[PDB]
Amino acid sequence: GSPLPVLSWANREEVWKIMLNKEKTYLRDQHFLEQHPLLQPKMRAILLDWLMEVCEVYKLHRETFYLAQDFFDRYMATQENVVKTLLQLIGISSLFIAAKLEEIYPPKLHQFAYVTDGACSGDEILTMELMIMKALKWRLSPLTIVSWLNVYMQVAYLNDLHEVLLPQYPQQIFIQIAELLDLCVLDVDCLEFPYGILAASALYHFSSSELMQKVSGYQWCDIENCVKWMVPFAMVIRETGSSKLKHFRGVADEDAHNIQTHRDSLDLLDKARAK
Amino acid sequence: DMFQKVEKIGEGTYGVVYKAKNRETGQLVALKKIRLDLEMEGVPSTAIREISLLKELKHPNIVRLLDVVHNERKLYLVFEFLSQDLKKYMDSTPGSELPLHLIKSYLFQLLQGVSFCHSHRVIHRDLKPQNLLINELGAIKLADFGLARAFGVPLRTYTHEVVTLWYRAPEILLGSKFYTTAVDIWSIGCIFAEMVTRKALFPGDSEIDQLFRIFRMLGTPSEDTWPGVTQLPDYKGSFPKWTRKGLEEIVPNLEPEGRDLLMQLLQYDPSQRITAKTALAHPYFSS
Ligand SMILES: CCc1cnn2c(NCc3ccc[n+](O)c3)cc(N3CCCC[C@H]3CCO)nc12
């Protein structure tokens, strides 16, 4: 099962089992917007796209963004009949929690309020964050989509079997795949696929089935439906061209691949879902 | 609320810990209280981390979170109660109350707890005797996960100058960009020695005093003992060049195989440092 090498600090198979059980304990519903019957999937795509932009401005990690997306989608699936006017508050509160979890120096509440441009106050965000955390039962430690890409890349590029914890993958392959994942995640249909299979499918579209299998342990039967779902998204990414690694002020250049970026993806999402 | 707040045990990494009792059950609990009215940024990062970790981290040698209660501008973490912590036990007792067999069973349990954490991709980053809770049956549990972090594989750069100074690993003192689960193993070696000697192994006053106490006993590290050590942010050629003191003289009452374990726990080079899993297979624990 384990694509991982032998580990000194743990059993490889056990570490990999623990990770797969997590995926099953954290449950996602591609149909959760049927509980909010007057909301459209485009509303979620705009909200998440907006959160990526906030992330890029505050040099937040991709991990912080994907944590917020998971909290958003799992919180909404616990609730019913949420009015479209509260999505910004739920989104920004999700990101507030995600930032306090993942960031060393997270932005202050005043900045999360500032980006909402009047709509959401600090008090509204403090109220909402508690509402979210109690609804989720404080289950705030998922393996995100991007956490799976981090580990697949490490396995692909592993040189030192004594340094499996020290990252040793190239930066441009990582951000190219993350760009495809950032596009897919704007479509709520993505939630039908486990987050490890989404990571694996986006890697396969930039790779081979030889590599996908090597880094992930999945077989073709496992990712087939996801891979096929993901094709219009891959195609659109290929035709628009991939983005170059950015430098971020105050971010080490060997750490810059971990910073969430943002392009005009709602145009790509239209193009993609056309097909 | 539904608790007779017997008393205040003390203060954690965050909040205040109280001993209390349930009225309905009569059961003894610990209460870590947060004042949400005094928190400009809402629930503290440390609290969100501890709650989220301990919801999914369950093991005989890890303290149990029983409930999280939100009543007013107050948030209460309800924990199983334990009667002693290792710091207060060691400050209240003779050496005879910490025999060689109880040190062995305490250390074994600590490694099982830490090993479970590392396999669940968690680093405590604050292992010290005050955070080690002991019951009357002979169990020891890790507590206070407010300074802990779930790590990724592979891991990124995280907060620096973590871990209480006395139990802090030298790769953190030399300002290394990446630290791993090995920092938790340094602390354990420091606690192991402290249990046998009844006093702290490295009682430093500063980061540089801390680093000199370590060098005095283990020797000043070189590219030969610790490859890359010279390329570390806070390394200086200006450092004195002490040499290894014999461990037989620090911990004479400790058996041969146990002095081998302590030497392996307290390796300078975090890459050459034993893991919790390997440590549990050590001959020390097979008589
Ligand atoms: C997790 C909550 C908990 C449950 N029991 N317990 C104990 N029990 C032992 C003990 C010690 C001294 C007096 N009394 O009455 C009992 C201590 C303790 N702590 C140690 C001191 C600073 C706070 C806190 C740090 C580590 O959680 N926290 C807890």
Side-chain angles (χ1 to χ4, degrees):
Chain A
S2 189
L4 314 188
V6 159
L7 313 181
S8 53
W9 48 278
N11 184 292
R12 45 187 292 183
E13 302 302 310
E14 161 191 66
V15 167
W16 191 257
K17 174 189 191 190
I18 292 156
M19 280 172 74
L20 294 179
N21 292 327
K22 223 181 206 312
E23 279 269 280
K24 303 160 200 162
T25 323
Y26 285 73
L27 287 180
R28 290 99 193 188
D29 183 16
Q30 73 182 113
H31 297 301
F32 81 69
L33 286 176
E34 288 176 359
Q35 307 168 20
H36 325 254
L38 290 200
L39 300 187
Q40 304 131 236
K42 190 69 190 293
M43 280 177 199
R44 173 179 172 289
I46 291 157
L47 172 77
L48 288 176
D49 179 72
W50 172 69
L51 287 179
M52 277 181 225
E53 190 171 13
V54 171
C55 279
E56 175 177 55
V57 172
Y58 289 93
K59 296 172 308 200
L60 296 187
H61 287 60
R62 298 167 181 289
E63 180 64 11
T64 306
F65 167 65
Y66 274 103
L67 274 170
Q69 164 273 307
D70 192 51
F71 302 159
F72 176 80
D73 290 321
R74 279 156 55 223
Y75 177 67
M76 286 295 295
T78 67
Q79 306 299 305
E80 270 143 351
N81 296 121
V82 168
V83 67
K84 67 184 185 181
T85 36
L86 275 165
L87 297 179
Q88 203 188 9
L89 168 62
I90 297 164
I92 198 60
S93 296
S94 299
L95 187 61
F96 185 53
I97 301 163
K100 291 188 300 175
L101 271 167
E102 195 56 54
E103 296 295 343
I104 302 178
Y105 295 119
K108 299 304 198 79
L109 174 63
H110 55 65
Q111 288 309 288
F112 287 85
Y114 182 67
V115 290
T116 77
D117 190 46
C120 316
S121 70
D123 288 314
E124 286 166 348
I125 291 170
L126 291 192
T127 305
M128 179 57 79
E129 79 159 353
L130 271 161
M131 285 170 61
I132 290 179
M133 284 185 297
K134 297 190 294 183
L136 298 192
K137 306 187 174 300
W138 304 92
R139 297 310 189 289
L140 301 173
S141 298
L143 301 173
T144 62
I145 293 158
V146 70
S147 77
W148 281 115
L149 181 66
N150 168 64
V151 63
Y152 292 164
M153 284 290 99
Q154 181 69 354
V155 171
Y157 281 100
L158 190 73
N159 312 114
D160 301 351
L161 186 140
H162 65 297
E163 312 296 359
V164 187
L165 279 180
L166 300 179
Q168 50 207 237
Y169 58 78
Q171 292 195 310
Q172 299 223 113
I173 177 172
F174 179 82
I175 67 157
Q176 283 181 12
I177 303 170
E179 185 159 46
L180 166 56
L181 290 175
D182 294 350
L183 181 66
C184 291
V185 75
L186 298 191
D187 195 340
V188 73
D189 293 317
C190 76
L191 294 179
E192 179 199 340
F193 310 110
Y195 287 171
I197 283 168
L198 293 169
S201 302
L203 173 142
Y204 163 104
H205 282 293
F206 279 93
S207 178
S208 60
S209 37
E210 187 161 298
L211 188 64
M212 177 284 306
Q213 184 156 40
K214 182 205 163 181
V215 296
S216 76
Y218 290 121
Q219 290 192 289
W220 169 255
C221 44
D222 299 310
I223 73 181
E224 167 180 0
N225 294 344
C226 182
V227 165
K228 276 167 179 168
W229 170 72
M230 185 166 297
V231 164
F233 302 85
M235 271 178 184
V236 162
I237 291 292
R238 293 301 303 249
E239 293 168 20
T240 309
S242 287
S243 295
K244 198 168 176 212
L245 177 74
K246 298 180 198 172
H247 161 91
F248 300 94
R249 275 142 193 175
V251 179
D253 271 2
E254 62 269 355
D255 304 355
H257 68 285
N258 288 313
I259 304 302
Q260 183 62 45
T261 52
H262 169 84
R263 68 197 286 186
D264 301 303
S265 302
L266 300 184
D267 312 298
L268 298 194
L269 186 66
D270 286 351
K271 287 187 192 71
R273 284 171 51 55
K275 319 174 181 179
Chain B
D1 327 299
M2 197 205 22
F3 294 119
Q4 176 50 265
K5 226 189 232 187
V6 188
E7 45 140 48
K8 169 190 170 178
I9 298 175
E11 288 170 6
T13 62
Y14 68 94
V16 176
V17 183
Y18 299 107
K19 178 190 180 184
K21 182 178 294 187
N22 185 1
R23 309 305 182 125
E24 172 281 303
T25 310
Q27 172 198 4
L28 232 56
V29 302
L31 293 181
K32 203 163 186 184
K33 177 203 66 186
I34 303 165
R35 309 201 69 229
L36 293 191
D37 60 18
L38 303 191
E39 302 284 4
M40 272 169 113
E41 304 297 307
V43 180
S45 164
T46 50
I48 295 177
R49 284 180 185 173
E50 172 159 50
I51 300 166
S52 69
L53 289 176
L54 294 183
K55 288 277 172 155
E56 303 171 61
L57 204 62
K58 302 188 167 183
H59 184 261
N61 299 120
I62 299 173
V63 77
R64 301 197 293 138
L65 182 70
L66 310 179
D67 202 11
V68 178
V69 184
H70 181 228
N71 215 340
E72 207 215 7
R73 271 288 190 183
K74 274 188 304 169
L75 198 73
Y76 288 106
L77 288 76
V78 190
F79 288 88
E80 80 174 315
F81 179 67
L82 279 90
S83 44
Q84 270 274 65
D85 71 62
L86 189 66
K87 193 189 172 180
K88 190 187 161 187
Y89 182 67
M90 274 188 315
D91 287 351
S92 306
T93 65
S96 57
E97 257 179 287
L98 194 46
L100 281 190
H101 71 75
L102 184 63
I103 293 169
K104 186 180 290 199
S105 82
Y106 278 177
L107 182 70
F108 190 76
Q109 289 175 74
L110 225 80
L111 286 171
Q112 285 182 129
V114 169
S115 183
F116 181 79
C117 288
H118 295 168
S119 69
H120 288 64
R121 295 164 302 101
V122 171
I123 44 173
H124 200 264
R125 303 192 298 182
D126 192 44
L127 283 175
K128 64 191 188 183
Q130 183 168 64
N131 291 323
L132 296 183
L133 313 190
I134 62 182
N135 71 11
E136 327 86 356
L137 277 187
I140 188 159
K141 306 193 176 181
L142 283 59
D144 213 327
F145 285 66
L147 290 186
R149 225 193 209 286
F151 64 79
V153 187
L155 52 75
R156 157 182 62 111
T157 283
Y158 304 123
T159 307
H160 278 6
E161 306 179 4
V162 286
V163 187
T164 293
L165 179 73
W166 286 357
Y167 305 86
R168 184 179 309 166
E171 62 272 16
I172 302 181
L173 289 163
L174 294 177
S176 179
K177 168 175 203 178
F178 294 114
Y179 60 78
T180 67
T181 54
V183 310
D184 277 346
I185 304 304
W186 183 266
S187 314
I188 290 170
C190 292
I191 294 161
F192 182 20
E194 178 162 354
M195 267 187 301
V196 169
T197 67
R198 278 274 165 173
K199 62 169 190 173
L201 182 64
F202 306 118
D205 308 353
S206 61
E207 278 199 299
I208 186 52
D209 185 48
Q210 197 65 50
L211 196 87
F212 282 171
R213 290 165 163 291
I214 299 170
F215 293 170
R216 248 109 67 179
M217 144 177 330
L218 297 181
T220 290
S222 66
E223 285 292 308
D224 299 20
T225 70
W226 183 357
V229 64
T230 60
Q231 296 300 111
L232 288 188
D234 301 306
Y235 179 101
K236 307 196 170 188
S238 326
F239 288 164
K241 271 46 177 171
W242 295 284
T243 178
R244 286 163 209 124
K245 315 182 322 203
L247 250 182
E248 218 268 10
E249 300 187 358
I250 314 306
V251 283
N253 294 128
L254 189 62
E255 72 200 65
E257 287 290 356
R259 277 184 287 102
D260 181 63
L261 183 57
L262 182 62
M263 172 213 77
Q264 287 190 63
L265 292 174
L266 288 172
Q267 295 285 341
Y268 278 125
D269 183 359
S271 299
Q272 296 185 244
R273 200 175 297 140
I274 195 175
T275 68
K277 202 200 178 198
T278 309
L280 289 166
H282 194 292
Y284 176 62
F285 298 120
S286 321
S287 179

